[PDB]
Amino acid sequence: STAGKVIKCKAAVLWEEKKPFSIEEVEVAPPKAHEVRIKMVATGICRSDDQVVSGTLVTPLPVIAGHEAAGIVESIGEGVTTVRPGDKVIPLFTPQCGKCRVCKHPEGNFCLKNDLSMPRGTMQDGTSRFTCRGKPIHHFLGTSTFSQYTVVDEISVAKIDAASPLEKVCLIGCGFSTGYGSAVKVAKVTQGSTCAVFGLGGVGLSVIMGCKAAGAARIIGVDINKDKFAKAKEVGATECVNPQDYKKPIQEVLTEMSNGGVDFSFEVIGRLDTMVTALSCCQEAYGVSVIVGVPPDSQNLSMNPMLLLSGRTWKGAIFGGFKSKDSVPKLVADFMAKKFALDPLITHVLPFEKINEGFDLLRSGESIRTILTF
């Protein structure tokens, strides 16, 4: 009987850029019409949550960040039909309203109700469900998973299998689905192709998993941190290259290695220069390059459009191109059926209260995904 009552609980509040999270008591309002309040069970530390701290991914502060998570419904607002109290759920940082021109399109997933293109840090109704020290606190991407309890819009949550291990399937809420979908859905990697993956973190390892699932013959991992190469090979890389080892730019190295350019390249870092390098290294007539990394706010890249004129395709995607609410329950079902592995992504486990230690592990280069448990 917390239904319809304010809940006091602990959250990780970010008051200022480039500062530690503050673990402290917040007030979580009850859900309004078509809103869902979730008791969080596990949440991943994604580089995009660090980009909020760095100020390179801009969203209003102060904020409760976190977007890669799983929990159990505590209560539903009036009119909710797609979840019930006690259901296991994954918050959807890319919503699926099911009504807009994008949700109706066979290949769109970037639903027009998203809080990604022009972040306001609110619920759909333009208000916050979070108070801290008597001050309103922003939401993040309509999810805000660094909290014992959050409130999300119904279009931002999916019901998943009741037997789901939530400390694993939280990765379906971001890094696994993003990287796997970038390969199998956005690029549509083909059997016997040569792929180059720039960045061997949680999301780039998931791209490798998707390239290997699609039957690529060669998967070249690219990272400046050679410590990332062993796990990249475990999940399917056939060879790994560190740009720092070479006198020549890595686009020239990769073009040589692939006897004239790769079939598919993926930027999975978030840098302007590696976005251009990744486009250049794909074959000039028929190559495809996919941007997955989140570039720094309000910065333009410079490129030569002759790279496109010869025949290259350049595209990007959020969340692996998956329509979120249709896709997340299916991805969980496929995980339960052993169609892909999540354990290779999980290098560390900590209690939520050690969230700062989890960010330090990511920043040091030591972790892939740290999973925090509430």
Ligand X SMILES: CCCCCCCCCC(=O)O
Q: Which residue bears the tokens 């979070």?
A: 130
Residue 371 binding ligand NAJ, by CB under 6 A: no
CA dist 203 → 122, 177, 195 (Å): 26, 8, 15
Among 305, 337, 343, 364, binds a second copy (CB under 8 A): 305
Among 226, 304, 357, 363, binds a second copy (CB under 8 A): 304
Residue 294 binding a second copy, by CB under 8 A: yes
# residues contacting a second copy (CB under 8 A): 42
Among 71, 173, 293, 344, binds ligand NAJ (CB under 6 A): 293
**97: partner contacted, choices a second copy, ligand NAJ, Zn ion, none (Cβ within 5-8 A by kind):** Zn ion
Smallest separation (angstroms) from ligand X to the CB of 76: 25
CA dist 171 → 69, 177, 332, 371 (Å): 7, 8, 10, 9
**138: partner contacted, choices ligand NAJ, ligand X, Zn ion, none (Cβ within 5-8 A by kind):** none
- 323 three-state secondary structure: coil
| Rounded Cα–Cα distance for residues 93 and 68 (Å) | 8
CA dist 32 → 39, 99, 134 (Å): 16, 20, 20
Residue 46 binding ligand NAJ, by CB under 6 A: yes
Q: Is 221 annotated as a binding residue?
A: no
Residue 96 is classified by DSSP as -
Q: Is 139 annotated as a binding residue?
A: no
| Rounded Cα–Cα distance for residues 64 and 49 (Å) | 10
Helix H or strand E segment including 1:
none
- Among 3-11, 136-144, 286-294, 343-351, the segment contacting a second copy (CB under 8 A): 286-294
| Rounded Cα–Cα distance for residues 320 and 178 (Å) | 4
Residue 328 near residue 180, CB atoms below 8 Å: no
**163: buried, middle or exposed (CB in 10 Å: 19+, 13-18, 0-12)?**
exposed
**222: partner contacted, choices Zn ion, ligand NAJ, ligand X, none (Cβ within 5-8 A by kind):** ligand NAJ
Amino acid at 109: N
Q: Is 338 annotated as a binding residue?
A: no
Query: Closest-CB residue for ligand NAJ?
Result: 201
Q: Using CB under 8 A as the criterion, what x/- string covers residues 202-241 for binding a second copy? A: ----------------------------------------
- When the beta carbons of 74 and 140 are compared against Zn ion, the nearer one is 140
Residue 200 binding ligand NAJ, by CB under 6 A: yes
Residue 61 binding ligand NAJ, by CB under 6 A: no
Among 76, 174, 268, 346, binds Zn ion (CB under 5 A): 174
**314: partner contacted, choices ligand NAJ, a second copy, ligand X, none (Cβ within 5-8 A by kind):** a second copy
Q: Is 319 annotated as a binding residue?
A: yes
Among 212, 228, 312, 369, binds a second copy (CB under 8 A): 312
| Whether the bond into 91 is cis, omega within 30 of 0 | no
Q: Is 287 annotated as a binding residue?
A: no
Among 269, 279, 281, 355, binds ligand NAJ (CB under 6 A): 269
Helix H or strand E segment including 321:
none
- 257 three-state secondary structure: helix
Amino acid at 346: I
CA dist 363 → 5, 11, 50, 61, 89 (Å): 38, 21, 8, 21, 29
* Burial state string for 238-254 with b = 16 or more CB within 10 A and e = fewer than 16: bebbebeeeeeebbebb
Residue 372 near residue 203, CB atoms below 8 Å: no
Annotated binding site: 46, 48, 67, 97, 100, 103, 111, 174, 199-204, 223, 228, 292-294, 319, 369
Site residues for ligand NAJ per CB under 6 A: 46-48, 51, 174-175, 178, 198-204, 222-225, 228, 243, 268-271, 274, 292-294, 318-319, 365
Q: Which residues bind Zn ion (CB under 5 A)?
A: 46, 48, 97, 100, 103, 111, 174
**Residue list, annotated binding site for Zn(2+):** 46, 48, 67, 97, 100, 103, 111, 174
